[PDB]
Amino acid sequence: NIMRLVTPPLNTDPENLQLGTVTVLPDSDEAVCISFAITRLSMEDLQKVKTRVDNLEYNQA
Amino acid sequence: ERTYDESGSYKVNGFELFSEGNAEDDDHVSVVVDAGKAYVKGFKVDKPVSTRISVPKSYDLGTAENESTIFNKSNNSISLANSPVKEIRRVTGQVLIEKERVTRGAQGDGQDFLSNNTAFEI
Amino acid sequence: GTAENESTIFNKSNNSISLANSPVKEIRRVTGQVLIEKERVTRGAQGDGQDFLSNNTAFEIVKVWTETSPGVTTKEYKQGEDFRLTDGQTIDWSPQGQEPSGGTSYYVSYKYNKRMEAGKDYEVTTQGEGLSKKWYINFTPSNGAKPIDQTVVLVDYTYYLARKDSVFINKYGDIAILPGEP
Amino acid sequence: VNALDDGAMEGQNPLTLRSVFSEGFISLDKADITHPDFGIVFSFEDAEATLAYTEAHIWGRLISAPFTEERTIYQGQASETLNVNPYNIPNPLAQSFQYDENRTISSLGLYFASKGDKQSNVVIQIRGMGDQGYPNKTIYAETVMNADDIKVSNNASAETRVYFDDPMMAEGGKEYAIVIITENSDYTMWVGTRTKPKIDKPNEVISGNPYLQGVLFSSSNASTWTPHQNSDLKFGIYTSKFNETATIEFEPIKLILDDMASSTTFDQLKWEPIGNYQDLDVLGLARQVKLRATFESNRYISPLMSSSDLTFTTFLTELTGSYVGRAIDMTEAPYNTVRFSYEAFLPKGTKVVPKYSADDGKTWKTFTKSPTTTRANNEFTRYVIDEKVKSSGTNTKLQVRLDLSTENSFLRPRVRRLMVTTRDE
Amino acid sequence: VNALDDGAMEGQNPLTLRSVFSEGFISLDKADITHPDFGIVFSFEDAEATLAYTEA
Amino acid sequence: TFTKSPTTTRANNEFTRYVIDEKVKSSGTNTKLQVRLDLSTENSFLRPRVRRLMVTTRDE
């Protein structure tokens, strides 16, 4: 599709983990690579998220 | 089974994408996937070194037809909307012929053919 | 044989237009200038941006305006300082002048070349028989899009070709035929 | 909820909250008023939205009125005439008031000393009062009064009655200001001024202030107001109290034996002739059936429809309209789940259909789930929908819509406190 | 974004949003006008800031 | 000064949105914040403009 409307293919296979998408420009050697891999969240990260939520509700108050 | 039922598939680290453009083939673009670790379907997938992959170049064509623009005598140039143009199939515009010599046919009240068969006004 | 860009001026008084070549097989394309009146368009979020029209073959903007009730023009935007036609596809608001607020809807009127559809915009009929038979494009349906009056309609179609062959006999008594050029 | 109370939005490239959209029905900034389907009217005093009457045969008399009016405020003393536009006569006015409780204003009373020609008209408005005791630009009601409707007298005896299509809910302890506007320079009104003789009783003079809690105002552009502390308009304000039911009767009436079966098949509680329809009829193939319609009354009944003389087509008009919000760009916050919440008051024979679009109004979708209902008050009920609109993938655009419709003119729906939020799950 | 439209800030011991700071360019409360390097001017109607002309 | 280059999104014909997201501190956490924008020109007519400044912090 044209660059304004191009989208990556839609997939729902559980057996595969998506690491990212590669976009190729029309008739060119250049290509745009982006990583969208799902990454874990350790307990420290979740605690930091909880602290962020606490700050959010404090600011709301 | 326990890992997938608890957390599903996820990445741990690595697996960054980088473009290199190695000239293994003119019809492909090389891409490098950096080393990393991940758990897919509950099974660990540890890769110590980067993996090279190649994508085919895009050559599929879109057709634009009846792209209209009003011609101005002051400015002769007219632009095309789609940028990566390959080839122009046809350009058509109204043209005026002045003083075209025509021979009268032998038959009376007959028909004399013009040099161009796309005429619409005398 | 292929006939392309066969031109005929369309008249509002007489919708029918004839095809020069008699044995027509199929009509590849019928195109004519059509006017769209009161096409709803939504303003994009980006200021001084571009809003895409439903048809990408537009070549002239007639009127751009907004309405709160039917027939009441709240405002009419002036072409050349408020907006301009870009690439025959978009209403570009890059000129300095006024523009609608982001997320608001406004009307657009414009002209474009529509590829007419058989059985929807026109119907094909015939009168005669044999070599005198003729094919016509009638533009009969009421809801179908008709060409603007006193504009050119281009038709692309194919038609069969005749062939003339010569009969020969050799000294062995073998009758044979050489095919001529169609 | 916090965004519900903002009521402000920029024109060119507005910053919008991601995954949030709410309408407090307090301003026009959030609404796409230029949309072709936009036909709703706001009531800023109540922060509600409703449908205004639109006209697009036999007469009918409103026997059991839907409410009873009572004159609570009345300043009767008058002494002088003041031109409605004093500062532009070759060679607008307002009067403030307030109530100590929550009252449903139904109609106004005004007294005009002179009027213009047949074609002239006067615009009557109710505007709010700001903190420093002056009229503001907010308008809670508006109507147009023709010259015929404006009665005049040389002794301040003629009282022209002003009705609005929507009742004005005056909140207790808040000031409000009647406003009178007209471009014509030949309109005058009676004003009572302290220390001046009365028109009908010169022997007596207005000793104290005519209306203590109000002030007369004058302006050259309906923005800057000059107060007249010692003067007040001669006016009266009527407040209403709605009753249980209302009844209309039509004047007596394609062959009667087919006609009465055909008619009583359509005149029923569920078709657009809403309410308990009844008739009586006369034998001998007489033509004079007489119709009656009874319906349940409420506090939102239009005083203009009650006061006006009905017909079988003005009544039984099916009003329609919709609210359409400005398109929201959710590119930086893709979503696939939507939580739609709104409070709606639904009299019998009314509907509110929520809708959404993820393509800038090109296509409008509908929710498959049925809303869960929680009661807000006696009238309004809260409707909430929580549905995964997209099974796979994520949308990047949002545009909220509500479709309102009615079966008859008197009974209309009302909506308020519209909150829409989106999520990615 | 919501804090961008506030445009108010107390003088002595102000309550401030944690991990948030935004300037709507509609008031001087958020700005440290007494800083040595402060040399911008406000355009409150446009909610913009720029530089004014100065000699030498 | 931030080491990353800002990602650009166009706002209108004049203004462009600049966004930076950088882990300013590799280890530990800061406890103070003071925002600053430095504006400069090289003639008297052509001057820059700024609006809608928003700065937020996180612990990651």
Side-chain angles (χ1 to χ4, degrees):
Chain A
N1 200 328
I2 199 67
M3 194 67 179
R4 199 185 77 267
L5 303 173
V6 70
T7 58
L10 193 71
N11 185 26
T12 61
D13 190 359
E15 298 184 346
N16 287 24
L17 179 65
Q18 189 175 351
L19 300 176
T21 55
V22 185
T23 311
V24 288
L25 308 185
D27 188 66
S28 187
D29 309 330
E30 299 181 1
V32 181
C33 306
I34 302 166
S35 52
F36 298 113
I38 293 159
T39 187
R40 79 201 199 284
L41 287 170
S42 63
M43 298 290 176
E44 193 173 9
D45 299 341
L46 300 170
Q47 287 292 354
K48 288 169 173 172
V49 171
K50 188 176 179 186
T51 300
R52 288 170 68 188
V53 171
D54 303 354
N55 303 343
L56 281 168
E57 59 185 3
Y58 175 82
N59 289 343
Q60 186 167 94
Chain B
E1 184 183 15
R2 286 173 163 277
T3 301
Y4 185 79
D5 296 0
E6 191 173 357
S7 309
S9 304
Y10 55 87
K11 189 184 75 173
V12 186
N13 72 80
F15 299 128
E16 278 75 21
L17 307 179
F18 306 101
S19 56
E20 299 296 343
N22 302 119
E24 63 184 18
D25 187 357
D26 301 323
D27 300 327
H28 289 78
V29 174
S30 301
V31 174
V32 176
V33 188
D34 191 10
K37 192 176 189 183
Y39 284 79
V40 189
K41 253 288 184 182
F43 304 94
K44 84 195 186 186
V45 182
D46 184 14
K47 281 185 158 287
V49 297
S50 56
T51 308
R52 255 185 167 79
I53 60 187
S54 56
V55 291
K57 282 181 178 176
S58 185
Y59 300 133
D60 293 307
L61 301 172
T63 307
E65 58 186 357
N66 298 337
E67 181 162 313
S68 178
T69 297
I70 292 168
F71 184 82
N72 296 290
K73 179 59 173 59
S74 297
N75 177 256
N76 308 324
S77 292
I78 58 180
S79 68
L80 306 179
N82 297 266
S83 162
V85 177
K86 182 173 180 186
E87 56 184 358
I88 300 115
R89 290 282 176 78
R90 175 166 62 187
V91 178
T92 179
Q94 301 182 355
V95 177
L96 180 67
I97 285 165
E98 295 176 0
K99 197 172 190 177
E100 177 170 322
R101 182 258 185 185
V102 176
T103 296
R104 182 69 182 86
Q107 180 176 332
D109 299 329
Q111 301 189 133
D112 309 325
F113 289 88
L114 300 168
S115 299
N116 300 270
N117 65 283
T118 57
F120 56 92
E121 180 173 33
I122 303 301
Chain C
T2 307
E4 60 187 343
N5 298 338
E6 181 163 324
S7 174
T8 287
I9 289 166
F10 182 84
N11 293 280
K12 179 60 174 62
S13 301
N14 174 254
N15 307 319
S16 294
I17 57 179
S18 60
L19 305 176
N21 297 265
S22 162
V24 176
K25 184 177 176 182
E26 57 180 8
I27 299 114
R28 292 281 176 75
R29 175 167 53 193
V30 177
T31 175
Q33 300 184 356
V34 178
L35 180 64
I36 284 163
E37 293 174 10
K38 198 173 193 173
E39 176 166 315
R40 181 256 190 185
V41 174
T42 304
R43 182 69 182 84
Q46 180 172 342
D48 301 323
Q50 299 190 139
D51 304 330
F52 288 88
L53 300 168
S54 300
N55 301 271
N56 66 277
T57 56
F59 58 92
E60 177 172 3
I61 304 302
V62 181
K63 191 193 179 70
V64 179
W65 75 107
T66 52
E67 301 184 1
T68 51
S69 59
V72 180
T73 303
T74 309
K75 182 173 175 60
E76 184 177 347
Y77 297 91
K78 298 182 177 185
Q79 188 173 0
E81 60 181 14
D82 304 340
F83 66 97
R84 63 187 188 180
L85 185 67
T86 300
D87 302 353
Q89 291 175 359
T90 55
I91 304 302
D92 193 3
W93 301 94
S94 61
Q96 179 180 358
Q98 303 294 122
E99 55 181 335
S101 305
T104 63
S105 51
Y106 63 97
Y107 296 108
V108 186
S109 183
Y110 63 99
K111 294 174 186 175
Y112 77 119
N113 289 279
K114 191 191 177 187
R115 181 164 185 170
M116 302 298 178
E117 302 296 347
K120 195 173 185 178
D121 292 335
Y122 64 92
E123 57 180 8
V124 61
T125 59
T126 185
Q127 294 178 349
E129 294 182 356
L131 298 170
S132 61
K133 191 172 186 180
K134 300 287 287 188
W135 267 252
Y136 300 91
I137 306 303
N138 298 338
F139 295 104
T140 305
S142 62
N143 296 333
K146 298 182 184 182
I148 294 162
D149 190 4
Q150 308 301 310
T151 60
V152 170
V153 176
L154 307 178
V155 185
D156 307 327
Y157 65 104
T158 58
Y159 56 93
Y160 294 105
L161 302 176
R163 198 184 69 265
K164 187 161 181 180
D165 307 328
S166 293
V167 184
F168 296 92
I169 187 170
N170 60 357
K171 60 182 177 179
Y172 304 111
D174 305 322
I175 292 161
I177 314 184
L178 299 178
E181 184 63 36
Chain D
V1 171
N2 292 329
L4 194 72
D5 297 325
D6 291 359
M9 191 177 182
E10 190 170 12
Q12 190 184 56
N13 187 254
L15 284 175
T16 310
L17 309 185
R18 271 150 55 171
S19 304
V20 179
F21 177 81
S22 63
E23 175 58 293
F25 300 105
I26 56 175
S27 178
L28 307 177
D29 301 353
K30 304 296 196 73
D32 192 338
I33 62 182
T34 53
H35 199 257
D37 300 330
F38 199 93
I40 203 169
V41 292
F42 301 90
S43 57
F44 303 135
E45 72 288 7
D46 296 317
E48 296 174 359
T50 180
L51 297 170
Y53 176 68
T54 302
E55 60 187 9
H57 57 91
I58 65 181
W59 272 266
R61 188 69 173 176
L62 185 55
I63 304 303
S64 297
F67 54 88
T68 56
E69 300 179 355
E70 181 179 4
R71 188 176 66 188
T72 53
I73 289 165
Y74 175 64
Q75 201 286 117
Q77 299 182 86
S79 55
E80 297 183 14
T81 54
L82 183 64
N83 188 279
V84 301
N85 189 2
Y87 310 104
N88 203 37
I89 63 189
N91 298 328
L93 300 174
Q95 179 60 20
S96 54
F97 69 99
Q98 60 178 7
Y99 285 98
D100 304 344
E101 297 181 349
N102 301 327
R103 318 299 288 270
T104 300
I105 295 164
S106 60
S107 61
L108 302 176
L110 300 172
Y111 299 80
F112 285 80
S114 73
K115 61 183 184 179
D117 65 80
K118 191 199 298 182
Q119 298 177 11
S120 61
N121 59 97
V122 181
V123 188
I124 309 302
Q125 298 173 346
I126 293 167
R127 298 191 185 181
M129 283 294 285
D131 206 7
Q132 296 110 64
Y134 284 95
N136 56 22
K137 309 302 299 305
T138 308
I139 295 161
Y140 304 131
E142 183 169 24
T143 191
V144 179
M145 297 286 291
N146 295 338
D148 295 21
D149 301 332
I150 293 164
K151 300 177 174 61
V152 302
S153 60
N154 64 335
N155 61 328
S157 59
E159 185 176 6
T160 184
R161 299 288 297 280
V162 187
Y163 298 98
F164 301 98
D165 185 69
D166 182 81
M168 171 55 188
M169 301 299 183
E171 298 178 3
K174 293 196 79 65
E175 291 192 50
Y176 304 95
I178 293 164
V179 186
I180 299 170
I181 291 158
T182 185
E183 84 303 346
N184 189 33
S185 187
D186 194 350
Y187 271 99
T188 53
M189 298 189 64
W190 298 106
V191 306
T193 301
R194 189 180 60 86
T195 314
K196 304 298 187 178
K198 301 182 177 183
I199 300 139
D200 63 333
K201 304 187 185 66
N203 61 325
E204 302 178 0
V205 299
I206 306 180
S207 59
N209 199 278
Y211 180 58
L212 189 65
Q213 305 189 6
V215 176
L216 175 61
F217 298 87
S218 64
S219 178
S220 63
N221 58 3
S223 185
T224 308
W225 299 92
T226 298
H228 302 293
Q229 295 290 356
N230 297 283
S231 293
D232 291 317
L233 296 180
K234 185 180 176 178
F235 72 100
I237 296 164
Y238 299 84
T239 53
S240 57
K241 190 83 80 175
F242 76 99
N243 48 34
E244 309 308 329
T245 56
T247 300
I248 297 158
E249 288 200 16
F250 298 92
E251 65 182 310
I253 292 164
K254 299 298 183 284
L255 181 57
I256 301 302
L257 298 182
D258 292 2
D259 195 14
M260 71 76 55
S262 179
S263 182
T264 57
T265 302
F266 281 62
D267 292 347
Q268 47 160 299
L269 287 59
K270 295 165 290 180
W271 284 62
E272 47 272 22
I274 294 292
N276 294 347
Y277 255 89
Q278 290 191 309
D279 58 12
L280 52 71
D281 55 5
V282 176
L283 302 90
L285 299 172
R287 203 190 67 102
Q288 53 171 57
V289 182
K290 201 185 198 296
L291 295 162
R292 173 185 269 202
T294 296
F295 62 94
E296 184 190 336
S297 175
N298 67 66
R299 66 198 297 271
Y300 296 105
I301 294 293
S302 180
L304 186 62
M305 294 297 305
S306 302
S307 59
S308 187
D309 186 8
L310 293 174
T311 69
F312 189 93
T313 47
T314 54
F315 182 85
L316 178 44
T317 285
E318 43 175 68
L319 301 167
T320 53
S322 301
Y323 173 80
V324 184
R326 292 170 57 168
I328 312 303
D329 183 15
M330 299 288 185
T331 296
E332 294 180 351
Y335 70 100
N336 64 344
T337 307
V338 179
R339 186 176 181 281
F340 204 106
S341 176
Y342 67 98
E343 277 188 353
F345 171 54
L346 305 178
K348 186 159 63 186
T350 58
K351 293 187 289 186
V352 173
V353 182
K355 285 179 180 178
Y356 68 97
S357 177
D359 53 359
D360 297 326
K362 298 179 181 180
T363 66
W364 292 99
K365 312 300 292 294
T366 54
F367 296 100
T368 62
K369 285 193 178 181
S370 298
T372 188
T373 56
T374 304
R375 194 175 192 170
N377 59 4
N378 183 80
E379 288 77 357
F380 289 90
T381 297
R382 194 184 66 186
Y383 298 87
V384 185
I385 300 169
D386 179 65
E387 181 175 356
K388 181 168 184 174
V389 294
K390 207 175 183 177
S391 59
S392 60
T394 54
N395 297 317
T396 57
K397 295 180 183 179
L398 181 63
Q399 189 171 18
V400 174
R401 169 170 178 167
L402 291 173
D403 293 356
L404 283 64
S405 57
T406 79
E407 281 3 291
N408 74 58
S409 179
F410 275 80
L411 302 178
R412 312 184 188 170
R414 306 181 73 83
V415 298
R416 57 177 203 173
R417 318 206 289 194
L418 168 57
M419 295 181 291
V420 184
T421 58
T422 68
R423 309 185 304 270
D424 188 6
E425 296 185 14
Chain E
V1 169
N2 293 328
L4 194 76
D5 296 334
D6 292 14
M9 191 175 181
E10 187 170 6
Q12 190 187 73
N13 188 255
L15 283 175
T16 305
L17 308 183
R18 267 149 63 173
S19 308
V20 178
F21 177 79
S22 58
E23 175 60 297
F25 298 101
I26 53 169
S27 179
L28 305 178
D29 296 3
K30 306 298 189 69
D32 186 356
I33 60 178
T34 54
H35 199 259
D37 300 357
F38 200 93
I40 61 94
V41 298
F42 292 84
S43 57
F44 302 112
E45 74 293 350
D46 293 321
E48 292 165 6
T50 186
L51 301 167
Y53 173 75
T54 293
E55 61 195 327
Chain F
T1 53
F2 297 95
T3 64
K4 285 189 179 187
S5 295
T7 188
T8 55
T9 307
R10 195 172 197 182
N12 59 5
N13 181 81
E14 288 78 2
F15 290 93
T16 296
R17 193 188 67 187
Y18 299 85
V19 185
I20 302 167
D21 181 61
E22 180 178 326
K23 177 170 182 171
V24 291
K25 206 176 184 176
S26 57
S27 54
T29 55
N30 297 324
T31 57
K32 297 182 180 179
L33 181 61
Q34 192 176 358
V35 173
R36 174 166 177 169
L37 288 174
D38 296 330
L39 277 61
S40 58
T41 91
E42 301 185 274
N43 78 21
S44 179
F45 277 81
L46 297 178
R47 316 182 199 168
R49 307 182 73 86
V50 298
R51 56 175 200 165
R52 315 212 289 201
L53 170 57
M54 294 181 294
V55 184
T56 60
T57 67
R58 305 186 306 274
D59 183 12
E60 298 189 355

